[PDB]
Amino acid sequence: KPINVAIFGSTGSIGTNALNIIRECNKIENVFNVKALYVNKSVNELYEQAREFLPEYLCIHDKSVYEELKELVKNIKDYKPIILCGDEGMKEICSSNSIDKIVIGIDSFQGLYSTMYAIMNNKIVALANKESIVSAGFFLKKLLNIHKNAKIIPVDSEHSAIFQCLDNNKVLKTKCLQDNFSKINNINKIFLCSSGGPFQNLTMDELKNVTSENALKHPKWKMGKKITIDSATMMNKGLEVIETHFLFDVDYNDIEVIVHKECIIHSCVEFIDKSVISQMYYPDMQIPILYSLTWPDRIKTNLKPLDLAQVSTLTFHKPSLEHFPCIKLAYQAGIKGNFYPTVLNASNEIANNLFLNNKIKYFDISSIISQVLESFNSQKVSENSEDLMKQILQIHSWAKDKATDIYNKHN
Amino acid sequence: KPINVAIFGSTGSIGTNALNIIRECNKIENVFNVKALYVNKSVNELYEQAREFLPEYLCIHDKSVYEELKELVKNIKDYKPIILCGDEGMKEICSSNSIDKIVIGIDSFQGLYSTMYAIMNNKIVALANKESIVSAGFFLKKLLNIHKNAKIIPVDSEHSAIFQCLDNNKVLKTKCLQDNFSKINNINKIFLCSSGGPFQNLTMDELKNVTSENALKHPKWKMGKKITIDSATMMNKGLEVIETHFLFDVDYNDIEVIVHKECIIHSCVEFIDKSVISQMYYPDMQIPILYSLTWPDRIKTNLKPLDLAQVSTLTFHKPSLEHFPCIKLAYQAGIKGNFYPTVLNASNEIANNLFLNNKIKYFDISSIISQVLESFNSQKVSENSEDLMKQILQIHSWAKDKATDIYNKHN
Numbered sequence: 001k002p003i004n005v006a007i008f009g010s011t012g013s014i015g016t017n018a019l020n021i022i023r024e025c026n027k028i029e030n031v032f033n034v035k036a037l038y039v040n041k042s043v044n045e046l047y048e049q050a051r052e053f054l055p056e057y058l059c060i061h062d063k064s065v066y067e068e069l070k071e072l073v074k075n076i077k078d079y080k081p082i083i084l085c086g087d088e089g090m091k092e093i094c095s096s097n098s099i100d101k102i103v104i105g106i107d108s109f110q111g112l113y114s115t116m117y118a119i120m121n122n123k124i125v126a127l128a129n130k131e132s133i134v135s136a137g138f139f140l141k142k143l144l145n146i147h148k149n150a151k152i153i154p155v156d157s158e159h160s161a162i163f164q165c166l167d168n169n170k171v172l173k174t175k176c177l178q179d180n181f182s183k184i185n186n187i188n189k190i191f192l193c194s195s196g197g198p199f200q201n202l203t204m205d206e207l208k209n210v211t212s213e214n215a216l217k218h219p220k221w222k223m224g225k226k227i228t229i230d231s232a233t234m235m236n237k238g239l240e241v242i243e244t245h246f247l248f249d250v251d252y253n254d255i256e257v258i259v260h261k262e263c264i265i266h267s268c269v270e271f272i273d274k275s276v277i278s279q280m281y282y283p284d285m286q287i288p289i290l291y292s293l294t295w296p297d298r299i300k301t302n303l304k305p306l307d308l309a310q311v312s313t314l315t316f317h318k319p320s321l322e323h324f325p326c327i328k329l330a331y332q333a334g335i336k337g338n339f340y341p342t343v344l345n346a347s348n349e350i351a352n353n354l355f356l357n358n359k360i361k362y363f364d365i366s367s368i369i370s371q372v373l374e375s376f377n378s379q380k381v382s383e384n385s386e387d388l389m390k391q392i393l394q395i396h397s398w399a400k401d402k403a404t405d406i407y408n409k410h411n
Numbered sequence: 412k413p414i415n416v417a418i419f420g421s422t423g424s425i426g427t428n429a430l431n432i433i434r435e436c437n438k439i440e441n442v443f444n445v446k447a448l449y450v451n452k453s454v455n456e457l458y459e460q461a462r463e464f465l466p467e468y469l470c471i472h473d474k475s476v477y478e479e480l481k482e483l484v485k486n487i488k489d490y491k492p493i494i495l496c497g498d499e500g501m502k503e504i505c506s507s508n509s510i511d512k513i514v515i516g517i518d519s520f521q522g523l524y525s526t527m528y529a530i531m532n533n534k535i536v537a538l539a540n541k542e543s544i545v546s547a548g549f550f551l552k553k554l555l556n557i558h559k560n561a562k563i564i565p566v567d568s569e570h571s572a573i574f575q576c577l578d579n580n581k582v583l584k585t586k587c588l589q590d591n592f593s594k595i596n597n598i599n600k601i602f603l604c605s606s607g608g609p610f611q612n613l614t615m616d617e618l619k620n621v622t623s624e625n626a627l628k629h630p631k632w633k634m635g636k637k638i639t640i641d642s643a644t645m646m647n648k649g650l651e652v653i654e655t656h657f658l659f660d661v662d663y664n665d666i667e668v669i670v671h672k673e674c675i676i677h678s679c680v681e682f683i684d685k686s687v688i689s690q691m692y693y694p695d696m697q698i699p700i701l702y703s704l705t706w707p708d709r710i711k712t713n714l715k716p717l718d719l720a721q722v723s724t725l726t727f728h729k730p731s732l733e734h735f736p737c738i739k740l741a742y743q744a745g746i747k748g749n750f751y752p753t754v755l756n757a758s759n760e761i762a763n764n765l766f767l768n769n770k771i772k773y774f775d776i777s778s779i780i781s782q783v784l785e786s787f788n789s790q791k792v793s794e795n796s797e798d799l800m801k802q803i804l805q806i807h808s809w810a811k812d813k814a815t816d817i818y819n820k821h822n
């Protein structure tokens with residue numbers, strides 16, 4: 001009974017890590033079939049992955065490299081995949097009855113589109129992309145209410161940890177990103193752990209002048225550029241607070257960010273009796289990815305065992321909101337609700353990219369995001385799913401444009 | 412739907428803590444009926460508990476204070492309990508259809524008797540007593556195989572932690588102290604945490620001359636004298652290694668003792684994928700006791716919330732087997748199997764009591780236990796439950812006598 005999986009964003013950090021744990025898992029016993037691979041424009045790298053995994057489907061988003069892809073794959077003998085392009089290609093893969101689970105390793109708001117179509121096709125969605133949940137949580141909840149057999153299984157490491165800390169006897173009565181989830185699961189409060197990022201010990205004077213080169217250098221594992229910058233600003237953790245709220249139905253007052261620099265405890269769940277359960281491992285994404293594909297079971301691996309005497313010390317401290325103002329902006333946006341999380345995500349996408357490209361300074365990131373949030377006024381939420389998606393898109397686009405306009409003006 | 416509970420050993424540390432969380436839990440909403448209280452000889456204290464809780468049944472083990480108990484309880488107006496004595500009284504309570512769950516807070520090998528009769532009556536046994544499991548694990552397993560609806564739910568804090576870390580979706584397919592439990596639950600390895608006791612930082616020269624007064628002073632919560640001495644020698648943790656083996660069907664090579672002096676992580680479970688799940692709270696017995704009575708659910712409490720920034724640091728180190736030789740003796744006994752754990756428990760009961768009463772020195776404890784273990788020869792295991800109990804009793808008694816004889820001889 002092999003598990004038929006598609007990897008969306010297969011050439012990025014998540015996608016390559018997913019293919020690695022799959023490869024390793026299969027050597028112990030052949031449990032996964034890699035049925036589809038989808039990328040944006042990394043045509044040479046997708047070709048190489050195609051030669052190794054020989055999926056039934058290949059898809060490339062950028063039309064300008066589709067012909068190139070076909071020409072390359074011609075060089076793989078005895079291999080006749082279905083080779084698709086763009087939105088229509090993604091939709092065709094999601095509607096295939098040969099695919100059971102889809103790993104969403106596409107970055108940014110863009111990952112919402114495939115997330116939505118995977119749910120609409122009643123698939124198990126092993127969701128790493130958090131911008132989708134932040135920007136469109138209420139929408140996704142409505143979609144999941146309609147598509148009974150669709151499920152989001154969280155891959156983001158902290159949310160995987162939380163999910164692993166739950167009793168599946170209770171989980172199986174509901175599913176993530178549903179009303180009443182915390183009540184059913186007896187959840188009282190979440191400790192959302194953070195690495196703290198590379199800037200965690202810097203002074204205010206030092207933060208003023210940090211660069212994106214400083215944020216990107218010497219990663220534990222290479223993550224994509226966007227998340228790496230968000231880790232440095234701790235906007236990642238702000239996004240993950242909102243993600244927690246939506247996935248697990250936890251009030252913002254019951255989500256506490258804790259800086260745990262060793263990254264061994266990945267997050268913790270306090271139940272209503274005050275007992276706390278936590279998930280622990282070395283800093284890795286292989287367990288989150290694997291668990292999303294095996295849940296509700298676990299399978300044998302040969303991963304390096306955790307050794308607590310080796311670790312020796314685990315530390316916890318609260319983050320400074322003066323140093324990391326993005327965290328507070330995320331809580332404020334989440335608490336306001338409505339489309340404020342959409343605005344938060346969109347403005348951050350622009351500010352993150354500006355800092356990445358050395359156009360603005362560290363504290364300008366939070367300044368831009370704050371100004372966009374203050375400029376937004378709540379809208380009535382469309383009652384129809386199609387209109388609600390259009391409204392999310394329009395607000396996301398406006399907020400990106402507003403961020404860019406603020407940048408353009410101070411120049 | 413109140414939960415009908417008996418408290419065995421109601422005047423001791425476990426028993427009084429059980430009555431405290433019950434009392435507190437009932438204020439939030441009335442979920443427990445205290446149906447029976449049983450003690451050895453603490454007749455005045457049992458009377459006081461009777462006046463507060465007004466259980467249907469009262470039992471006192473020591474015949475010489477039974478009349479006194481009756482005379483005292485006469486002073487409680489409008490109260491006509493059933494007042495029993497000894498083994499026959501315990502058996503009558505265990506066979507009552509009005510009792511659903513029994514907390515076993517009786518110390519030492521003596522706690523085996525009520526444990527056995529609670530299982531024979533198909534009850535939920537909230538078992539704090541570990542000497543029963545160490546001395547008679549294979550026997551209890553056979554009994555639990557026959558008595559389908561009987562269950563041991565562990566109360567010992569580390570074993571409660573382990574149990575809490577399991578997925579009830581899998582637990583409910585089996586029960587503790589059963590063959591194949593680890594396979595069903597996907598358990599690979601256990602981290603068995605320890606406080607390390609009051610002697611953890613002493614040198615060999617200092618250990619030579621430690622006293623029982625040193626071991627007993629200034630407890631976090633007052634525990635009984637026997638367990639307190641076993642914590643000081645780390646024989647408690649040796650006993651708990653064997654307890655882990657039997658409760659959870661974990662090989663001794665897959666049980667690792669770790670000294671965690673802050674006592675926040677109560678123990679950890681490594682699953683076959685290498686993910687680790689742990690349970691955390693302040694050092695307390697209220698959660699273990701409560702969970703044993705609410706499992707498979709959890710209920711609301713108003714316990715002090717865990718605060719990780721307050722805790723700040725968690726530490727882990729391996730215990731020194733030179734300083735704490737009892738640990739190694741326990742592993743050796745467990746690995747040999749047969750009745751060696753019975754012998755280990757019995758010899759320790761004598762050696763612990765000798766040290767408590769200032770008759771022997773610290774390293775004489777392990778010396779006596781080691782000599783008794785070396786003197787024992789494996790026996791064929793009786794095939795009949797009744798004969799098997801007689802054989803356990805005979806070996807336990809011999810091993811106590813052998814320990815005392817070794818003491819008597821070196822004097």
Ligand SMILES: NC(=O)C1=CN([C@@H]2O[C@H](COP(=O)(O)OP(=O)(O)OC[C@H]3O[C@@H](n4cnc5c(N)ncnc54)[C@H](OP(=O)(O)O)[C@@H]3O)[C@@H](O)[C@H]2O)C=CC1
Nearest residue numbers: 009011012013014039040041042061106107128129223224
């Ligand atoms: N990296 C990590 O360990 C973690 C990541 N995440 C989340 O996972 C997501 C992915 O992050 P990460 O892997 O770091 O990002 P990367 O930048 O490393 O990878 C992004 C991937 O998405 C592909 N992609 C981009 N646009 C499209 C498109 N329109 N259609 C199809 N594929 C597309 C890229 O293709 P191409 O190569 O062709 O450009 C690439 O394969 C993010 O949402 C992030 O927050 C969460 C937890 C940790």
Ligand SMILES: NC(=O)C1=CN([C@@H]2O[C@H](COP(=O)(O)OP(=O)(O)OC[C@H]3O[C@@H](n4cnc5c(N)ncnc54)[C@H](OP(=O)(O)O)[C@@H]3O)[C@@H](O)[C@H]2O)C=CC1
Nearest residue numbers: 420422423424425450451452453472517518539540634635
């Ligand atoms: N204290 C703790 O926090 C922990 C304890 N445990 C285990 O729990 C058990 C109890 O320990 P603890 O509470 O510390 O011990 P205590 O010495 O504090 O209490 C023992 C209790 O058992 C009663 N008792 C003794 N013999 C009999 C008998 N024949 N019939 C009925 N009752 C009897 C005693 O009655 P009386 O008062 O009349 O003498 C007393 O109520 C031990 O097996 C220990 O290992 C495990 C984890 C932690």
Ligand SMILES: CCCCCCOc1ccc([C@H](SCC(=O)N(C)O)P(=O)(O)O)cc1
Nearest residue numbers: 156157194195196197220231236262263283
């Ligand atoms: C050896 C110790 C140092 C390990 C450092 C490597 O581990 C991490 C772990 C987490 C993260 C977070 S960003 C990525 C993410 O969201 N994930 C993995 O779920 P954040 O900084 O926001 O908490 C970054 C690095």
Ligand SMILES: CCCCCCOc1ccc([C@H](SCC(=O)N(C)O)P(=O)(O)O)cc1
Nearest residue numbers: 567568605606607608631642647673674694
């Ligand atoms: C504030 C930090 C200091 C807390 C010290 C108080 O907590 C503990 C916790 C555990 C124990 C063990 S003996 C009792 C027992 O078996 N339990 C509770 O399950 P051991 O020493 O064998 O690990 C003793 C004391």
Ligand SMILES: [Mn+2]
Nearest residue numbers: 156157158240
């Ligand atoms: Mn994360």
Ligand SMILES: [Mn+2]
Nearest residue numbers: 567568569651
């Ligand atoms: Mn214990």
